[PDB]
Design a binder for this molecule. Structure first.
Ligand SMILES: [Zn+2]
Ligand SMILES: [Zn+2]
Ligand SMILES: [Zn+2]
Lengths: 113, 65, 97, 100, 117, 58, 88, 58
């Protein structure tokens, strides 16, 4: 399943500093045109979606979505100990480069292609 | 570090730079204990008279006479 | 008489003795649990030949002797010398009494 | 033809042994062998008060480190210089060379 | 009665001279300080004095100028001003009269109270 | 010192054509790179990396 | 501690590549092998010592840092390296 | 003529204390009523009902 493929992308992409969190930084990275696999999430306003979608198309790179902002929060590694664990939400995110190859990167690029 | 200072000429309009000379206790701290007093500076040691006497026999000094 | 050479020679010999004294302190703190007994340290000719005398040897040989690899690295770094130019021999002390 | 070899050392017994060893080597090769020249020792010294504070009778100590040295001037061919230089390693004595 | 004079020069001329010219009058140790150039602090002090003498008009006094530039020799540009010199504790106020030329600001302020047992 | 007002998500710098093509709404600096945009208020147009204010003749 | 994310990962990889580090105290200079301010490298490693990951020994003017075995793994998880990778 | 950029819901003119008391963030005009606030850019501070731009000595 592609959910684990995103896990395999995001962890390695944030150990080395190559995963960017937050709508504002995603915006400047789309403009600067040095990014891949932008994650949208569900709960955002129609205007805010329209911004990301419009830019992400204009940048001419792969775009994707995930079922909740808490599902993205796990990928971003915002998770923390309750005692058990809880996940802080993240809205939108993307990767700068793949630092080492992984099967999840291939599976995702094939899901795009 | 060799620090630098600006200074103005008599016109108070033209500027020039001068270098601060390294002198006094401030950079000659004991290499064993950071002390500022009683530092032996000879033979490019930089070690205080207290520290010297415990290490002298390891360095290779002896009291012959 | 006067020698231009004497000051250099005197400075050079003093500097070697200072490194010995420091490295000895380091190994004593690190290896008092090993019965660290003495050190040899020929700085005057590459390769730097280190002989360390110990009572027990398990913890220096343990896990592919990485403690040796680390001591070599720290001596290399403190002396500002290439790690390739150091040999470390560990010697079990005989006649311990 | 000529070589001058400086054996420099802050220990007397070592320098005495190593020079006797090298003198033996010279006389065993027999190139008209000779003793080393005994050099003026370099002596660096420091004078300091014994007590770590001002109390008591001021008592003073002089520490001095002596760097002994011996010179051989010698006649050899270039092969014998190159081959014999294998003798000049694994010593606490520092060894230096001059040539013409 | 004659005009104030310092080493031959009238206050009218003296107040018009550049610092470079005034340097030919001063004592040897003060000359050496001006030859070796002013600090960034001293320059701000002097520019404020030049501003103040220009700005002040009528009969109202200009505001006090404070300084920790103790070793600066007194210059003909700060005549008539009120200046506060740091004593190691407080800005001690004084007015720069004509007769002070050829001396440093430290010469007119005590860093240590007089002793009476 | 004083308090800093904030203008939330900055999107006002641009305008969007019916074709979806995007262009800057404010004008751009000649000497700070075209990626630096220029403010407006009364007689004043102004800039960031240089703090230079142009004064209009109106 | 006032280090950039780039500076943090530069220390993590160095400390894994070679199982030791050596820092000079009371210095505003740059660490020869990293190009990071000495006080900042000390402050970073300080945390690893507190976490029990790294030994510290202080001799004359130098702090000698040694990475424990029971912490090679933590730094390997943190740096997200492959399971086969080990220090020199 | 040119196009007009827009800054959405204007709330940047003010700042809010921890007690909930509100104060203007930008400074206010002396001669247009205190209800008119003053812009900033580089050397320029500027005003609305009078178009007057002050130039700073920095
Ligand atoms: Zn000392
Ligand atoms: Zn500009
Ligand atoms: Zn107005």
């Amino acid at each position: 399943t592609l959910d684990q493929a995103l896990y395999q992308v995001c962890r390695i992409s944030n150990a080395n500093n190559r995963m960017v969190k937050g709508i504002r930084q995603v915006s400047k990275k789309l403009l600067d045109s040095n990014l891949k696999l932008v994650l949208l999430s569900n709960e955002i306003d129609e205007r805010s979606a329209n911004i990301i979608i419009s830019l992400a198309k204009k940048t001419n790179i792969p775009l994707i979505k995930v079922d909740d902002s808490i599902t993205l929060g796990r990928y971003a590694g915002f998770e923390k100990r309750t005692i058990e664990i809880k996940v802080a939400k993240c809205g939108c995110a993307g990767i700068v480069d793949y630092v080492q190859p992984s099967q999840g990167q291939v599976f995702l690029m094939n899901a795009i292609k | 570090m060799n620090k630098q200072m600006i200074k103005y000429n008599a016109d108070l309009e033209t500027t020039f730079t001068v270098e601060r000379k390294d002198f006094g206790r401030t950079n000659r701290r004991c290499r064993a204990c950071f002390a500022y007093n009683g530092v032996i500076r000879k033979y490019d040691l930089m070690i205080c008279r207290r520290c010297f006497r415990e290490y002298a026999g390891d360095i290779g000094f002896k009291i012959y006479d | 008489m006067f020698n231009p050479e004497a000051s250099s020679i005197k400075n050079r010999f003093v500097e070697r003795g200072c490194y010995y004294a420091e490295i000895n302190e380091f190994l004593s703190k690190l290896l008092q649990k090993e019965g660290f007994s003495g050190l040899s340290l020929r700085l005057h000719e590459r390769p730097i030949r280190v002989v360390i005398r110990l009572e027990k040897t398990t913890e220096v040989l343990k896990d592919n002797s990485v403690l040796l690899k680390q001591i070599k690295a720290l001596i290399g770094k403190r002396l500002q010398e290439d790690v390739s130019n150091i040999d470390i021999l560990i010697e079990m002390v005989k006649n311990k009494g | 033809i000529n070589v001058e070899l400086r054996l420099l050392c802050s220990n007397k017994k070592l320098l005495s042994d190593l020079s006797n060893r090298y003198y033996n080597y010279l006389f065993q090769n027999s190139p008209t062998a000779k003793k080393p020249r005994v050099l003026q020792p370099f002596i660096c010294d420091v004078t300091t008060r014994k007590s770590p504070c001002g109390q008591g009778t001021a008592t003073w100590s002089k520490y001095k480190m002596i760097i002994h040295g011996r010179m051989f001037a010698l006649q050899m061919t270039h092969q014998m210089l190159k081959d014999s230089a294998a003798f000049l390693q694994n010593t606490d004595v520092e060894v230096r060379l001059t040539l013409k | 009665f004659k005009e104030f004079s310092y080493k031959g020069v009238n206050l009218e001329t003296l107040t018009s001279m550049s610092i470079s010219e005034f340097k030919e009058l001063l004592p040897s140790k003060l000359r050496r300080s001006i030859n070796r150039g002013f600090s960034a602090a001293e320059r701000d002090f002097i520019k404020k004095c030049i501003k103040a003498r220009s700005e002040n008009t009528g009969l109202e006094r200009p505001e006090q100028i404070n300084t920790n530039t103790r070793n600066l020799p007194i210059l003909p540009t700060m005549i008539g001003l009120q200046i506060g010199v740091y004593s190691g504790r407080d800005f001690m106020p004084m007015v720069i009269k004509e007769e002070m030329l050829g001396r440093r600001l430290r010469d007119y302020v005590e860093t240590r109270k007089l002793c009476t047992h | 010192k004083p308090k800093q007002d904030i203008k939330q998500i900055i999107l006002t710098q641009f305008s969007v054509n019916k074709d979806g093509e995007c262009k800057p709404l404010r004008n751009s600096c000649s000497t700070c790179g075209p990626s630096v945009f220029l403010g407006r208020s009364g007689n004043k147009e102004y800039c960031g990396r240089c703090y230079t204010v142009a004064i209009l003749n109106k | 501690m006032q280090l950039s994310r780039e500076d943090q990962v530069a220390i993590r990889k160095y400390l894994f590549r070679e199982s030791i580090c050596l820092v000079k105290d009371k210095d505003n200079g740059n660490h020869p092998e990293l190009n990071i301010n000495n006080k900042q490298v000390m402050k970073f490693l300080r945390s690893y010592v507190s976490r029990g990951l790294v030994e510290k020994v202080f001799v004359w003017q130098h702090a000698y840092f040694l990475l424990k075995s029971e912490g090679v793994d933590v730094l390997r998880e943190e740096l997200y390296l492959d399971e086969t990778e080990v220090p020199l």
